[PDB]
Every structure is written in C-alpha cells, then in structure tokens.
C-alpha cells in the first residue's frame, strides 16, 4: 500500500493505490484507500486494509456526530487531535498485527490565507502527530521511493492538474519499487484513485483524468 | 519466482521468469533462471538466488566432468540421481533458509520412440524426485497458479510454437496471481527466458519470439 | 473443504462439497456446507464444521430477528456488516484453531439493473470484506484451484445452467488437486449441493441435476 | 500410503498404492512403492518417499554384492538382520521428520513344506523385527484399516487369484477410510502395483488383472 | 474404552464394554458405560470415566427437567443441541486432561417411516454433530477397530436380534485388537452391556442373552483358528 | 534531542533542539520541544515525542485549572510534586517505550533575593527531583556532551544575552557529539528554539537572535 | 554509511561517505571507505568498519598474488567469483553481526566497446551477485534515497565530471535523509571521496574538485 | 578507568588514572595503566585490569621478538596491526565479560614533518583501528568527559608541559564527573602517571610535576567556585 | 550511600552523605538524606532516592495527622509499628527494583532513665525491626565498613561533641572503601549533614562545625 498527498497553491491532492496482498499472493486490484471524511478534509490510511476501513468509518461517524451535536464543525486542530487519541488507542492491537497508520489531508476554511490554507499531517504508531510544512508526505511500504520522488518533481506543481500528475507519477514510482503497491494496470483499466481538495470542497478526480495521467506517464518512461 | 516446462511431440521447453526480490523490495528485474548445462538437458532452479546459480555452475561442471572423464555422457538416470544427490546433501542449508528446489527437462537420445522423448523431473526439498507424466510441471512461489493454467491449455500444444505460447501463457498467469513473480515488462522490455530441447539440442529462444507471444497474449486479454 | 461462487446473468450460484476429515482420516461424507440464510442471499463457511453450522445458525437468527423487529430486511450492506462484525469478533478464538471464515453470495432487489444484482463478498480473518468485481471467488483449502479453474471457465458462462456446470467442474478441479475435498462419489451417489438465487429468490439445485452434470464432467475427462 | 502383504498357499502377495501427498495436496498419482530385491523377496516401505526409494536401493545393492561376493545367497534371517540393522541405523534421522518403516515378503526355498514357504516381516521403528504368523500385515498411515479388512476377508484366500484380490480389496478399503491412501483411479487408469512370489520366483503382476479385480470390487460395492 | 451403535430395521441397538484402566494397570472390571436418558434415547460416553458419569446424570437431569417444566418432551434435534452444547462447553477442561466424547442413539417417535425412525449422532472435541446415516458409529480408544468390523458385518442386520450380535462381535474384535478395551470375562462372568431401543421404548438387555451371544462368537473364533492357518501352517 | 537550561543573573533560559528521528531516519526537522507552560515557568521534555506533546499539554491544563479553581496559582514546590507524580505515573509506560524524561525551568516571584529566583529542577524515570545548584542541567540523548560543554563556558555567563549565546553553544556540541541531535540547520533555516524567563515573565526568543547566535558560533568555529 | 557508483559513457565513479557511528555516537569523519584494489576495480564495502577494512585489505592481497603468480591479472567474471566467496565465506561471522556488503565498480579492457565497458556489480548477505545493467547502485544504509535520486538524475549524466557531480548530489541526498550518513562538512572541510576509473587506470578524485561540486550543490538548495 | 592521550607540536603524551574498583568497592589506589612498550610507543588499555596487564605484556613481548629476531623495528603501521590482531582475537573472551580496549600513542621517526610526528590510535572491540586527526582521544568509562573537556581545553596545547597540564586537567573533569575513574589523592599522595614522548623517546614524567600541576588545578576550581555562584546565589 | 546513628549519653546522633549516583555517574552531589520527622525522632532511608524522599515526606504526614488527630503524639512503638507497615508494604516495589531501607533515631521522653533514654532502630527488607543495643547502626551500601569503624570508635564516645566526630570519621572511612559514598568535598565545600536529638529535640547541626571536624580529621589521616 502505498498513500501520497502534496499541496499545491489553493488547495491539497491525496492519491491511493488500488492493490492488497496477502503475503506473495494479490488478493484485491480495485481497493479504494482515500476517503472524504468531511467537505474540507481527506484521510488515507495504510497497513492493514480492515483496521483501515473501520478507522475511517469510525472517524468519519465521530466528525458527523460532533458537527450534528454541536451545531459547528470541529476545528482542524479537533480533527487531528480525535485521529491521534484514536491511533493511540489502537496501540495494543497494532502491536498484535493490526497496525493502522493513517494520513490527513485538509484545507483551512478558517486561515488567514486562502492559497496556504492546504495542510497535512502525519502520524506515528505512537498517536504523535506533525503538521508537515515541506508540502509532501506519504504513509505505506512504498513511502519512502514515493516521498524521494516528490522531493524531485516537486519543483514542477503549480497548479491542482500539475499537483495531480506529481502524485500519479509518485505513487508510479513507488509501485516501480515496491511489490505491495500496484501500478497503473492497462489490462483491467484499473487506476489509482485521488481526492482534490479547494475552497469548493472535496471532489473525487474522476477516472478519465487520471488514466490520462498515467498513461502520458507510461508513454514518456517507454522512451 | 517461477519456472515451468512442458512437453510437446518431439522435444521439452522450459521457460522462466526475470524477478527477483528482497521481500516486498523489488532488487532483480532480468535475473536468468534457466540454464542449459549441456547440449540435451535444461535446468531451472527456484529459492534463493545464490544457492541456484551455485547449484546450476556446479551441476554442469559435475556433469562436463564425468564426460570428459569417461568420454561418454552419463544417462538420464545418472543425472537425475546427481541432482538428486545435490538436493539431499543441501538439507541442512535448506533448513537455515538457503533453500533450492531444482526443475529438470531433457531430451533422450537414447529412448525409442523419438516422439516421446521428453523428459521433464521434479524435486522434493528431502531429494526425492519423479519424472512427471502428466506432461507439464512448475516449480517457484507462483508454481501452482501456472500449472493450474497449464492443466486447462496443454489440450492446444500440437508442436514446439504452440508449447512455447502455453508456457509463456502459463507464466503470465503465474505473474498475474504472485507479486513475486514477474510479468513481461512492455515499458522496459523484458520478456522471460524459454530454452527449446530437440533432437537437434538445446537452443536459446530468441527475444522477439517471446516478446510477440507476451503482446499477443496481453492483445487477447485486453 | 472448497466453497465456491460465480455469477451468471440474472443471478448467482454457490456450491461446496460434501467431505470432512480429521487429519487424514475420513469422518464424513455427506456435510452440507451451503446455507440458505433468507429469501435472497446464500452463506458458505469454511474451516472448523462445528464453528461454520454455528455460524451460519446464529447468522439466520440474527437476520429473521432485525427483519421480524423492525418489520423490513436488512440492506445488502447491512447483512455483510454483521457478517463481518461477527468474523471479527471470532478472531481470538480463530488464533486457538476454531477458524471460520465465510462466502457471502446474494441478489440485490434494489439494485438497479436487474441483470447485474449479483452480489459476491469475501471475507479474511481479520473481518474485512471486499465485494467481488471478478465475478466469481472461492473459499477453503481448494479455493485456490478453484478459483485458477473458474480463471479460464468463466468465459463459458451465459446463463444459469452454465453457470452451475462451471461450478461443478471448478469444485471437481478443487478435489482433483485437494485431498481434503471430497470429490463426485459415484458409488456412494453423493453430490456437491448448490444454491442458485435470482428474482424468484434462493432455490436448491435438485440432486438429479448435479449428478447428471458431475457424470458428464468424468465423462468428457475419462476420453 | 498403504502397503499391505498377505500369505496364500503356494506363494505370498504384496500390493501397495500409488498416492504420495504433500500434507493436503496430491503431489503424485502413479509412486511405485513395491519393489522386487531379489529372485525371491519383495519389499514395500511406508513413510517418506524418497528415504523409501534409496532404502530399497541401497538393500538391493547391498544383498547383490553379498551374492556376488560369496556366490551363494544370504539366508532370510540374514536378509531380516540387514534390513533391521538399516532401520535401526535410520532411527535419528527418522526422529527428524524422515521415517521409513519396511514390510519385507519372500518365499524360504529352503523351508520344509512347501506349501509354507512364504514369509511376511514386519519392521518398528526402533529397528525390531518379528515374523508375522498370522497370514497377513500392513504397513502406513491406511494400515489399520487394511489389516482390519483382511482380518475378515482373510478365509476366501484359497490360491494366488483370491488372495490378489483381497490384497486389492484391502488396498480399496484403506483408501475409502484414508486420504493420504489412493484408490482406483478409472479416470486415468492408475491401479494399484502388485508383486507374486511363489517358488518360480517373483514377478509383477499385469495391470490389466488387477484392474479387473479393482472394477469386479467397484460394482460389488455399488 | 468403546461404545458401538448400529440401526436396525425398527430401531437402535448401543453397546459397549466394562473396562477401566489407569495407564496400564486395570481399574476396573465392571464399570457401565451406557445410559438410558428417557424413554427413547440412549447416551454412551467415552474417556475420562467421571466426566462421563457426570455428563450423563447432567443431561438427564437436564432433559428431565424441561419435560417437567413445559410438560412436553423436547425434539431429538433439541436434545442434540443440549447435548453439544454441553460438549463445547467442556472444551477447556478437555484440553487439560477431562475429555469426554459422547454417542446419542435414540428413536424418532415423530418421525414418518417407524422402521426408519432409528438415530445415530456422533460427536467431536469442538461440539459439533453430524447424524450418522451410514447405520453404525463408534466412539472410544478401540473405535476403529469396531467401526471396520461393523463395516463387514453390517450386511447381515436384519431385526434386532442380529444387531445385537453384531454389536457384540464388534466389542469382540475392538477389545481383539485393543489393550483398554475389556473382553469377555468368562472367568468371572462379566459381559458388555446393551440398550435395545424400539416403538415400545428404550429397555437393557439382560445379560443371559448377551452371555449367550459372546459364547457363540468365541467358539466360532476358536473354530475358525482350528480351521484356519497361516496360509497352510499352524 | 537535546535540552539546555541555564540561570543567569536576573533569570533563567531554556533550549533545545529540532530534529525527531525514528531509528536512523530523519523524520522531524522543526519539532518544538520547549513549551511556555504558564507566566512563569517553562517545560522541555526528552524522548518519545507524542509522549513529550502529551505531557506539556496535561501539565499546562492541570496548572492553569488548579489556578482557576482556587484564584491563586500554585508555588513552585507544587508544580514540581505535579510534574514528579507524572513522571512516576508514567513508569509503567515507559518500561514498555514510551519514555519520557521532563525538565522544568522556572522563575519564583515569591522568593526573597530577584537576582537568585532562577529555578532549574530535573528529573529521573521514578519520578524524583532535584532543584541544581550548579546553575546548568541538560536532558535527552545529547544531555552528557552539552553539560561537559557548559561547564566550561558557564563562567562567561553575565546576563540573558551571554546566557543565550553559551545555550546555543552547547546545543551546538551536543548536535557536533550525537547524529539524534540536529544543529542549525542554514540551507533550510531552522534554528533551535529558546525561551527567557525573568521578572517579567517567560517570552518566545526571535528566531533572527538565535539566528544570529548560531552563525556567529559557526563562524568562530570555522 | 553510503557507497554509490554510476557508469557514464567511457568509463564509472564511485564516491562514499566519511561517518563512521557507534549507536547514536559519531566515532569518525573522515573515514575513507572507496578503495582502489587494483588498476582498473574500485571496491567500496557497507556495514562493519573493521570487517570492510580487513576485506578490502584482504581482497586486494588476493588479487595481486594471482597477478604475480600467474603472470596474468584475473578476468573481471574471476574478481567477481572470488568477492562472491568471500562474502558467502563470511556468512557465519555476518549472522554475529560483523556484516559486510561490498559493491565492486571496474572497467573491463577486453569489452568489445570501449564505451561500455564500465561495469557494476552488486552482492548480497547470501554471497549472490548480479551485474547491475541500470547503470547505477548503490549499498549501505541511506542506499535507498540514493538510488532514488540517482534514478531521477541519471539523465543528466554524459561524462565523467557530471557522472562525478550526480553521485556528489546522490551522497548529500542520501545524508540529508539518513543520519548514519554524513554530509559536507563544510566547518571542517571534510568532502565525500571519490574514484574515477576509465582506459587509463582508476585514479582518486582530488579533494578541491568535490568540494567545488559540494558547494555548488549546497548554494543550488539553498 | 580513564587514559587520555593529546598530540603537542614536537611528540605526544599519555596519561592515566590509579583506581580499580569491583563494583563499587575500591580494591586499588595505585594501579598503573600507561606503559613503555617500545622507545617510541606507549600503549593504555582501559577494562578489566588482568586482561589489560596481559595484553600490555605479551604487545611488548611480541614487538622486542620481531626487532630481535629482524634487526629493524617495525613500522608504525605494522605495530597497529599487530595490535588490531590481538584485539580482534580477544572478541570471543570480552563477550564474555573479558574486555580491553587499547589506547596506542607514538613518534613515527619516519614521518617527513618532526613537528607533527606524533600519532595517536585508537581501537574498538571489533579490531577495528583509526589514526585520530584531531589530536587527542579517550578511552575507559570516564573517556566522554575527558575528550569534551579536551575540546575546550586543547586550544591551550602550545608544548609538552601545556599538553601535559591539559592531559591532567582531563583527568581531573573525567574523575569528577566518574566514581569508577580516581582522582588527585592528596591525602595519600597519589597521582596519575603520564608517559611523554618526543624525538629522544619515551620517558616517565617524575611524580613531582604531575602533583605541583594537580595541585594548581585544583586551586584553580577552588578559587573558580569561591567566585562563582548559581546564578546570583552562592 | 551511607546513612550513620549511634548513642551518646543524653541523646543520638544521626549523619549521612550527599552523594547520588546513576550507575557509574554521579548524579548529585548535595542531597540531603537525614530528616527530622517530629521534635524527637529523625529517619535516615537508603536505596533509591526517590522512594526515600517519598517515604520520609508520608512518614511525617502520617504522623503529625495521628498527632493533631488524637491530641496526643505516638509513642515510640507506635511510630516503629507504622514504619515497619510502610516498608513491608513497599516489599512489591522493592522486589521490582524500588528498595528503601530506613533507619530510625528517636529520643524516648517518657523513657525513666533520661542517659539512655536515645533509641536506635534498624529495619530488613521483610519489615522486620529490632531496637538496636549494641550502641550504633548503619545503612547503605557502605554501611559494613562504617559499622566496623564505629566497632572500634565507639569507645571514644563521652558526650553529644565526640559522638558526631565520631559519626563523620565513620562516615569517611565509609566513603573511603565505597565509591558510591561520598567524601567531604573540600573543593566545593560540601559535608555531610547530621542532626542531634536531646532532651530540648531535634536540631540541624550547622554545616560550620561539621566543616571543622572533616577538616580535622582529614589533617589528622595526611
């Protein structure tokens, strides 16, 4: 598995891979790992695919409940808090093979400056969290051969479609370089799956865009 | 990994894949797992990488030693009980995670029938070994999901062609199903290694042959 | 044990064989491991028989419960939550070896197209489940050729009847290559069971039928 | 596996299946497992395959060099001590997972009655041995339930023909209440291997007889 | 330790033997194994022999005790449930040395055909039953011995006279072939016990007859060895 | 990680480091690890960093509500018993990993002489501590090098500003002497971060002095 | 610790990093780990100080004796054979760990092409060994931000000062994401080693020319 | 146990502390850790003590056999190899507990530069060696204080007596921030033995100068600490 | 440490070290581990720093909460019964790394003969308590060497001056044969502290006269 997100100016972009194994064997190609929690907030969780499903259901249920609760949707700072003391908690069964490390994706209606209002934060097994202020992050097996090729190609985001491109090309890469994360497959049309995020909200990309992507990708790595 | 062979009238191919990995870390991408260790025999070796390029240097050097020695090539049944021998002797490795389990194809020169003279012997990690009569075997991670595909397509494999598209097929299917097993890389490619035994020897196949079986069967399934 | 699910158009099919064994000896050779839950959906459980006739006892229960309560079925996701809810919470007891692990296969009326309310969902061992978008899916010891059999015989499929044809040879494949699937007894006359479910709802497969498929299985691979 | 060895007046038969598995799967279809060591002696081994093989090999050659090197044949009590001293010496690597356990047949030439000159020799693992005296013994995982057939199937055998086909119908049951034993196998048509010794010597049973008697017992049963 | 069941046309017939042991040394000469529960059904349990005398007290009480309450006997699948669930329960106990495994034989008052109404449902360590409609089961150390030679003479069943001397040559070659199991004791005249369940109830069969059919088969035995041999040697 | 407290004449200043690693990965380049927990008190907290965050948010809370509960805050020696029964709270924890090692530096308004109302007070992993009277003390992995570096420059302390400069120093031995502490880092500009505590109350350093500072001391160095 | 290497048209480079730690201590900074062995191979070996030390001591003695002994330098597939069996042969003393995984760079003069015949050869803890065809590799612990900067630098590779400039960005790559790893140390004026081997013989980089490129790199992130 | 070993212009000098503890009893005052392996070398070893004392003998042993036996001394390089040798073949016995840890300083006469002859090695318990380069280096429990306070110090190093006061000095801060490393003993009259090296070889430094240096520096830190306070509070 | 108590005629003396250590390093050098409980008794507790504090601060409270409960203060046995609780209900703890062995001095006001009216109690590990007779007690880990030495000083002893130079000369010897007691620091100028208890109650002896007789007798042993 492997879960990208990278800011660009007016918004954020989080981007998943599609596959599961079960140690050598493939057991899924079409898993959706990002979610839209709220209108303004996205999450990607990475390790095991159950614990990940249930902890963003969960997570989505307790944001739903406060907001209908409390007639006001909780602060972003609420929103990484509740994720951390839930990660927290999942300590005892992480530590006997249900580990879930999960990755924040948000924009700030309430910041002062609308094209910095993007934000990402990471976390530990630990429940500690990081707000991260390099514009990248990445969670998953493939993390670090994702993250060292953000650390290149993130000269080139300008934009939301140049940002979206970025991450299809990560987590390509990190599919290059990983056996758990799977890589664009032509055969079946089974592509990766991206969230972008703007002052207008959270909107799935949709699939065309992104097989475009990728295939202009593929084309320019084939020579 | 994975390597399978079949038998086709008058003569065996063995095919292979090119992946190679270090866990969930891919290190190998055109790593050559079949060797022709002399001008009738193919060996394939699955596990791990040192031990089976160990195992294929020291098995041919073995077998073109008893050769030049005697001046006479050793039997089938010699062959098989020197790898056989190999196999058992490597047990005590094998238990530390330096496991090796070879595949064998030959071609008898001294069988009757020369239609029927394809060989194909597999290995047990105790050094037992069989010769397969079914006519197709695979060894490697993803040995089960290729012989499973193998069962349903050897009905169509009439010559040396249409064994190799099978095998190639079989490999895909392999690859499709084991993430340690890799399929034909189009963006850089690389395509898996087929040796064709005849009465003629043991060739090489040559990448294009294998390159357009691998479109043709990506085509089909697309 | 092999359990196994293919969908045809218009509906689904699930069939499992009839063999229990201890070790290497045989204990039994007429199990029924194919439940009719409700109207419209099929349950198949493989591992421990005890824990699986359990499982699928308490499953029924809970379903005709909630349906009789609240005076309307459950939803499709509905019953795969339970399901799942109930894997998981019979995970401490899976890691001292009463491992079950369920195929869920069922007919969506309120699906829109009528042609493609087939349902299939599989399930781990740690409660996840994943609809299947393949087509087909197998459970137990034998799912693996099974499932590489029903691979390259799931072309054939156009209807009903070829899909019970498919699934019979994919479960004689299964105990071809199994040795703790039990095969067509021609001597004994016992026979896999089937379940077929479409519009009219869930519906056993007589024995006639299966034993006259299963005899021309043997017979075209006797020549 | 299930080797089983029953005594006829006039001779002695031993029958044994073809399964070899590899825990739950079936890794083979045709294993032979009886062997002819000699003019007048047959040998079944139970266990791991190839430990099995290279046993009846190595006692094979161990009583033909003694032939050779004396030029008179070992009596049956020396051909049980080698065969006892051979399982006894395996005993530590039998504790490690490579159990071989033999059942020895033969016919005693130079017996007083004739028509009592067969043998069965059954074998422990600790290397004991002890001459069966009650006309039948099994050996392998299906052994118990073969000896309990024969058991009641043991006062038809009047010549060769109807002990062969209890042998057979043994070797029937045993598979019927055991996986790990094959049966007869009409779809490939793979029967069971058998071996009749009398005082001509020990030849191997045709294939077509016993699946004369494997189909006879099938429609009895159906 | 074993208990056999076989059907026969018009019921059910469970036997078993009269041997306890500790280890190697013989315990016990006497002991009875096989329990009538109520009017139709019979329980034999194999193992531990005082988790095996509680069981069965418990399940009686157990069954008796809801007949009392709802003045209505329970169902034979009921009784099946109650029994396993008892028998899951005992799961940690079992793993500690306390097994105990079961045997249920009964006959069907509602069921349609009375000469099939007979019931046979065998048990195993995680609680789980399966009815047994191949006519015979075993349980215990010596099952398999019994359960191979009911599978020979399971042919010559025809009422319920010969079912119980099958059952008896069953318990013959068990203890035959083994040590735990008890023999016929004719040096102090001790026989295995049986329970013969039919329409009119579930009754103990005295032990003149079983005494009666355990000579017949041991000079039978002792015949055939006379005129047996090792393929022509004795 | 690294932390530095020092008093000068007239107050107290605390300092520490940037950078989080997991193993030998760098994973944090601008983690804060001193916090203002009230007016006149300041907390650096060393070793696991959620435990450290957790620890500087409830210690904030519970001083602020025991002073809004009773309308007056708490003595010094309060503060302390606080923090010491955190810290023997957290013993189990931190036998499994999560250990986390606190060091308080305050300022007492209450005490008679101003010029001597700094407070450096440290603690060990059973929850004791001790108020030094050495005028330095310095926790986390660095701890040792940055004591040994401030002792030796300790006696150039005057006021706040020299207080600052030996701070900044230490922490930048500490960072020369250990791979888990990081140093000023000029490519990116990150800087450690520093509070001053006096009479006035307790107040966040610019990052352009400490800036300045540390380029100064690179300079020197150089 | 990080060691790369990278063929450029004409001939290779092989540069490396000067830490050596002991836990989170750092023990050295200007540890040399390149080694010319002999005049047209360079090894560099990862892990264990004194264990690559005495390898790369001990595999040049070995060379050199051959050459004098047989008059003959050894082929570039015999270097390879022989470093594979020192490090099979070290296999036991690595479990203890004293590991120690080399990675050999030379020229080949008899290729065919001149061009290419750099070469790259990479080992395992197993004593396997694959002649890498990417065109880079790299060994140690921060190999894997290495590689992956390599990987997307490589294009900009067309003779041997930017071949020497890629690896010189690669190895502050590397240290910038690794701790064990270090960097330019431009207070010391400590820069990474390096050795560019071509036609005329392998000769070590010049300490000015890598500072030069060092600096360059840093003013370009800055 | 501490040795501390610094590079002045013109030769190097070596010093050490005198106490050997059992835990945390004192069972020595004036143990002698730094010795005169050949004219130009002198080696400390930091750990157990007989192990130490051991290595030190057989080192010296091994070094007048080769010069004996050849007629040349070794060069410096071949001493360390020698000496990286022994070290990695005591492994086995230090996992054991066995450890030593050698600290070697000496005048290379083959160096092209007098001035910067000096050389001082260091050893880990792999075997592993490496010449320091910048110019001093510590071994034993107290070896962290003792090299940072060399850090500061070593700007002082202007000859051998500077250098030698400054090896003191860190002695002095290693003893004070470790109970396992002794002190100046002025009640005893004991001081740490140093062994300075320069063009003519290696000599003893006489205990006089050691103790008139000790004793200055501890009035130094007297004085130091009169002056101070913590922070405006004494 | 080392914790000192011994009679005189009038009353009893108690002293202790300033030294705390982590291991091998010296953590304090300034703690203070004799405390006056109430007017008439002073404990002294060794081991882990922490629990030593702990336990003197509950100690106390318990006892002045008995005092202004009841009206009327504990006698001696009650205030030894109470100790004792403590330190066996601290056995958990003890066992697990958290050892506490106190030592009680106290002065017996309803006593008849007022000359030996002074109380030494010592306590094991168990909570067991024996009122000492034999004139003095120590505890600590240099406690056998300070006992031997008051074993021979105790005749010395005339009134409340020789038995505190008494105590510091044993208290020297103490810190002379153990590393983790600690001297008179003539350089910093830290003593040891003591505390007298009399008829008029417990006073803090001044750190002057303490000076004066370490100085005495550090004169007296050079």
């Known amino acids: ?18 596959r599961s194994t079960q140690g050598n064997m493939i057991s899924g190609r079409d898993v959706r790992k990002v979610y839209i929690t709220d209108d303004y907030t996205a999450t990607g969780i990475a390790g095991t695919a159950a614990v ?18 409390e007639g006001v949707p909780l602060t972003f700072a609420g929103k990484i808090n509740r994720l951390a003391i839930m990660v927290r908690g999942n300590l005892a069964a992480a530590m006997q093979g ?3 490390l999960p990755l924040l994706a948000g924009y700030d209606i309430h910041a002062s400056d609308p094209q910095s209002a993007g934000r990402i934060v990471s976390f530990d ?7 991260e202020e390099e514009g990248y992050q990445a969670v998953g097996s493939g993390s670090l051969f994702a993250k060292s090729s ?50 207008d909200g959270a909107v799935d990309v949709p699939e ?5 992507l990728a295939r202009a990708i593929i084309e320019s790595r084939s020579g």
């Open 125 to 131: 097994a630990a429940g500690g969290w990081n707000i």
């Open 150 to 199: 953000m650390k290149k190609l993130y000269s080139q985001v300008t934009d939301g479609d140049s940002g979206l491109r970025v991450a299809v090309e990560a987590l390509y890469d990190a599919a290059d370089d990983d056996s758990a994360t799977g890589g664009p497959d032509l055969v079946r049309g089974i592509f990766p799956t991206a969230v972008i995020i703007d002052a």
């Open 208 to 212: 065309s865009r992104i097989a475009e």
């Open 98 to 100: 249900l580990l879930a």
């Open 1 to 18: 598995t492997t879960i990208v997100a990278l800011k660009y100016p007016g918004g954020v972009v989080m981007a998943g891979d599609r």
């Open 52 to 69: 990940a499903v249930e902890f963003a259901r969960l997570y989505a249920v307790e944001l739903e409940h406060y907001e209908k609760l």
